[PDB]
């Protein structure tokens, strides 16, 4: 009568994988570091009447090479892949991440959203577009999110989620 969800939030660093996590699990938001991450890996929640364990793995301090960024990526279902919308080079990094996914799974389908963060910010500097060209070649879906304001918070990870259903479902 629960569902366990293993999601793993990757992405270059500042881009808001932690804010976007914690706002998830704690509803709580600010913009500076926040230390409260250390206190944010699962929350239970109802998703489309299913009471779902989403047990969130946040990927920021680990090198871009590491046995534990290994592990997650191993134990990952399912894998948001953040860049911000002010950071050009966090977008360019994407293809990256991607990769490095698909090579420890073996796999050219595994559940993944493009998240596009600090929609909030004006002065962007990758358009809207550029992410869903992008989103399209690998498949998955994108979606706009603000950690700050909530914007597309519970979309993307929710969107994951039934993205793993399917896969698993068939
Ligand atoms: C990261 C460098 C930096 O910004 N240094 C100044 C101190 N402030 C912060 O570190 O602020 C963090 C977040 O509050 C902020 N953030 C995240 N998501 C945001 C959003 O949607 N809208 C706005 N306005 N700000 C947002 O970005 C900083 C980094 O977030 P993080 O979540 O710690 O980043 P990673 O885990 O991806 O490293």
């Known amino acids: 009568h629960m ?52 047990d969130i793995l946040d990927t920021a301090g680990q090198e871009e090479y590491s046995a534990m960024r290994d592990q997650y990526m191993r134990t990952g279902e399912g894998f948001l892949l953040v860049f911000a919308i002010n950071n050009t080079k966090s977008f360019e990094d994407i293809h990256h991440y991607r990769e490095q996914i698909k090579r420890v799974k073996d796999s050219e389908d595994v559940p993944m959203v493009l998240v596009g963060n600090k929609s909030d910010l004006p002065s962007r500097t990758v358009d809207t577009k550029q992410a869903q060209d992008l989103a399209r070649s690998y498949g998955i879906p994108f979606i706009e999110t603000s950690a700050k304001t909530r914007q597309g918070v519970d979309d993307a990870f929710y969107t994951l989620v039934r993205e793993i259903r399917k896969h698993k479902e068939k």
């Not at 808001?16 to 944010?40: C, M, R, W």
């Open 3 to 54: 569902t366990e969800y293993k999601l793993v939030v990757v992405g270059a660093g500042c881009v808001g994988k932690s804010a976007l996590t914690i706002q998830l699990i704690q509803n709580h938001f600010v913009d500076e570091y926040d230390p409260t991450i250390e206190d944010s890996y699962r929350k239970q929640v109802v998703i489309d009447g299913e009471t779902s364990l989403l």
